[model samples]
Target: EDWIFLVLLGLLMALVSWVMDYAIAACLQAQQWMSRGLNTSILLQYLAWVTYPVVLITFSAGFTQILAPQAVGSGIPEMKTILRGVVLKEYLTLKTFIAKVIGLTCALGSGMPLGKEGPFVHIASMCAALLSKFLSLFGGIYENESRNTEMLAAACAVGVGCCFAAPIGGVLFSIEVTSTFFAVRNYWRGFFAATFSAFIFRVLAVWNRDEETITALFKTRFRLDFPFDLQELPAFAVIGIASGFGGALFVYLNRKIVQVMRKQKTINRFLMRKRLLFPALVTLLISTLTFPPGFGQFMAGQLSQKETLVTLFDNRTWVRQGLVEELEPPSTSQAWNPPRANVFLTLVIFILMKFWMSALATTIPVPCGAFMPVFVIGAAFGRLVGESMAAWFPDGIHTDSSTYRIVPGGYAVVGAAALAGAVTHTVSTAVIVFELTGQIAHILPVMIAVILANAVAQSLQPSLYDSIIRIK
Candidate 1:
């Protein structure tokens, strides 16, 4: 009976995940359309760009504040508390479930530097809890507290699986984030549920005709023969070291900002007191900074989150070719060419700008995740390093027999895995990256980088979720 419920929960969450993705894509398209249509005047264009995000963010924060304050922010900390046996009142209620879904959609749609992975865990847990309520009417195993908690744990795995389509990594991530001491007995349950959810989530893309066959969410075309040269190991390690420090800095800043916001009487009273106001202000600031006509061009602000990742991980070197290729404009086509910027300078600006931007964005009173933004920052950092390497060794690194060219995309992949692992204090991100890009050719370097990054990050500060949990 429990196994059957787990399967059903996976299917349900897959559908929800698919629907949310569809809605978010539509929202992004609408925002893009509005921005392009109002291009007659620079002022109007800026207003269109900024106002859309502000409105969406305000709506997200407003409803969350009114309907379910508990839904605000990534719910991982609250879920962690629940898994620890301290029942948080109404954290998993159906109201929270709805608020999280709606607010998350709006928040991500607003183009904020947030991910859905964390809140998806919260939503999945809510579903599991709600289903358990139904099972409780039967008056059997559902009444067992431990059993219900175990199901919630599995649901956490399903959430991650649905988000990233990485079943094994999802299970590992759930255990890392939500469990102090995981029960070995529940391993199969988590894997089973996560696998089902990940499979169904991928299948939905096929059903929607997005792909002819089920494929990895972010596919890459890296050379399988030799993705990275042996000489690049040192560079990969450098990325790991940088990521470790970067992750720690991010966690520290995020924690301090949250503390300052709460501790500062005047600011908190004026801004934080009004939940909608804070998110609105943050959105306005971010949107203004990211306006394509302004400083946004330096940071590739026109690219959506997934598009940014895809562009960052491109196999071709941006240093050699142009960052934004000019395409012939069509009357009906809505796609616009991104502003051309110096690849090196743009990457630096992106990392520096998003470092603080993402940290502050996390403080917004909206259902948003911190992982994807960090992942992007790391990828940008890695690409910068990789591009430098490519420039220095343009011919290729000479070995005894054959010369191997540098692939900057590989470094971006490694950096993403390492940094995300560092921030979350989980090595499973390496596996998640492997599954994400469908390229395991660089697994050795990726694992090495992730381990190094995790070591540095863990020794310096707590994981992002732990910091939030402590602050709470």
Candidate 2:
């Protein structure tokens, strides 16, 4: 079988993913640097306050509104419509591709709690769409709509695999979420593309890092080695149920906000006529509220969203410096010290602040993805539960000669799947979470939580993508 086209498709996707992540990392580094440095000087502070709005609006709104309006809002709903036989003119044009890249990078760097994963799907699909048109250059027919559609479908899987570094999860996710119908033959294509794409994506990640050893995009050094006991399944179920309600609440509130946004002609007119103004205002407001003197201290200061997620998943210890200072130990209970305020309290504040910020970010005319933020929120709450459970059962439940421990990290893993599964209404969240961590010991708990969350979420509301389709 001639599978070279699929190979090339995967390779192209890797290159695209690499470039996109590189740009995003560069922007986030700059943003974080300014976030820390601007604190010392009033002039730097004023300059940052003055300069941020210009930067946020220029790329997120100015370029997007001028270049391609269709490049906004994650593009998943539009992709779903396209896959369902709707024709969208200029939706995947080269201009839109550039617009999405710039808009997404700027939006993320502007302190919006958006993610790059969802936009990567549209970007990779656009690659496939653009590539299909150029098939004639290889002496291949470019008019095979079904064939090209199959390739685009495969590219969607590859995008997820590349972004999350989870090829199997991406293939399964595409099977579960993206397509309404599937031919068994295309399954191999999706897997093939995802495998090569994820492999190359991770390879390029390490190459970019100048490291001798390969590093995962989301590397965790925590103790995730089979950290759950049989008795903790009930707790896991409760986390799932809570995530289900949380997901439903998020969907309802988001729709309600959308309703209010649509009814206000003043805002709608600004969004339409002066797109830059509102986005600028939104960015300025978020940045101001997130400054150190504001609620930023309660929200992990200036760590990027990715760093915050890592911190949430880390169950090793709360105090970063405590571990370093523990070379010599005092034999007293008061000797073991932690931060003045419990770290969980900060996570609580973060969830409260991020929930509304994430919701508001969606209303802006820029590429925004909710998956990472949603999962991070879930992980935060899951960690909270894990902490409570650990406190309640510090030595854990005893079974014969074995003292089964309730690993806090294990709770985070299940919670990530539960909340994201609830929000997206998909079972494949379990697969992605497991694959993202490269650990399968907690897959059972994750699966149980994800299914329960999905059941509750679907019963109450349509997934966010479906909601967006209706709004669009």
Using TM-score as the measure, which candidate wins? 1
Q: Over the stretch 318-373, how does candidate 1's per-residue lDDT look in tens digits? A: 56554343653432111122346566777788889989999999888888898899
Span of 10 residues, lowest total lDDT, candidate 2: 330-339
Which 10 residues in a row give candidate 1 its minimum summed lDDT? 328-337
Q: For candidate 1, what is the TM-score? A: 0.95
Collision pairs in model 1 = none
List the global CA lDDT of all models. 0.85, 0.75
- List where candidate 2 sits over 4 angstroms from the true fold: 46-50, 210-212, 221-226, 317-325, 328-340
Q: Which ranges in model 1 have alpha carbons more than 4 Å from their true place?
A: 322-341
Error of 2 at 263 (Å): 1.6
Clash number for each model: 0, 0
